[PDB]
């Protein structure tokens, strides 16, 4: 359910990195690890944030009203 703003552990803004990550995976066709590092997510607390996120909102938006 939607990309968290900021990493719970440290605070680095991650809420602006999602769409960018998705283009890096789909359009650039790179692997998650190189995708995360290209966005500038050096620490593993910041890595799990995006890598471990499930974007349930896309499914929720499918609900008619």
């Amino acid at each position: 359910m939607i990309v968290p703003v900021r990493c719970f552990s440290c605070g680095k803004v991650v809420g602006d990195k999602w769409e960018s990550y998705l283009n890096l995976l789909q359009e650039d066709e790179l692997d998650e690890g190189t995708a995360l590092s290209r966005l500038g997510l050096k620490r593993y607390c910041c890595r799990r944030m995006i890598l471990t996120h499930v974007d349930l909102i896309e499914k929720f938006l499918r609900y008619n009203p």
């Binding site: 998650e32 995360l36 620490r43 607390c45």
Partner: protein, 196 residues
């Protein structure tokens, strides 16, 4: 709780600054005690952590499937390839002083579950309230503002203590207590209460 039979309540909440910290500046979201490990023998918990650390670093999903040839060595080999000490240990500095802890901490990511059973849904206190019609005793349940049961098992501890009056207070002043009239002849509750 973790996915390894490790249930535990929040003891206290520390902000980022008071928390122990990595040379990288990483800080735990959670601190679990070493004493929860030896007797419980939940080794997979420790392995999940090693794997999950490697997984977050490399940007891959860790294969924690049972009957596989995934070894602690194999994982350790990959974690070191990421410039970390192979067994999950990390040098950590004290949040209060900045001084390095003499001990290195097994630090890394572990999948933790938020369970039900939350203090606020459990807390109850009663100091006089609703009384059941028949028994004239405090009602039952938090949802009804009930009285905590002081069972016979509890009555026993008080007898053991030799606290004769507290035991009388629990069963009279708090809870029950009623004034009846007795006939000196038959000794029954036949005396008609015509007070005033």
């Amino acid at each position: 709780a973790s996915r390894h039979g490790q249930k535990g309540t929040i003891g206290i909440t520390y902000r980022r600054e008071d928390m122990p910290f990595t040379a990288e500046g990483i800080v735990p979201d959670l601190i679990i005690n070493p004493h929860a490990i030896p007797s419980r023998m939940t080794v997979a918990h420790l392995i999940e952590c090693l794997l999950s650390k490697v997984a977050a670093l490399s940007g891959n999903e860790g294969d924690a499937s049972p009957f596989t040839d995934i070894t602690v060595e194999g994982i350790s080999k990959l974690l070191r390839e990421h410039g970390y000490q192979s067994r999950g240990f990390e040098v950590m500095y004290n949040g209060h002083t900045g001084k390095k802890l003499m001990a290195q901490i097994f630090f890394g990511p572990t999948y933790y579950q938020r369970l039900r059973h939350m203090v606020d849904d459990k807390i109850h206190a009663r100091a006089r309230g609703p009384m059941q019609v028949l028994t004239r005793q405090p009602v039952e349940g938090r949802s009804r503002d009930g009285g905590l049961r002081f069972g016979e098992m509890e009555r026993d501890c008080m007898i053991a203590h030799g606290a004769a009056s507290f035991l009388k207070e629990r069963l009279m002043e708090a809870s029950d207590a009623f004034r009846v009239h007795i006939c000196g002849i038959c000794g029954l509750m036949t005396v008609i209460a015509k007070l005033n």
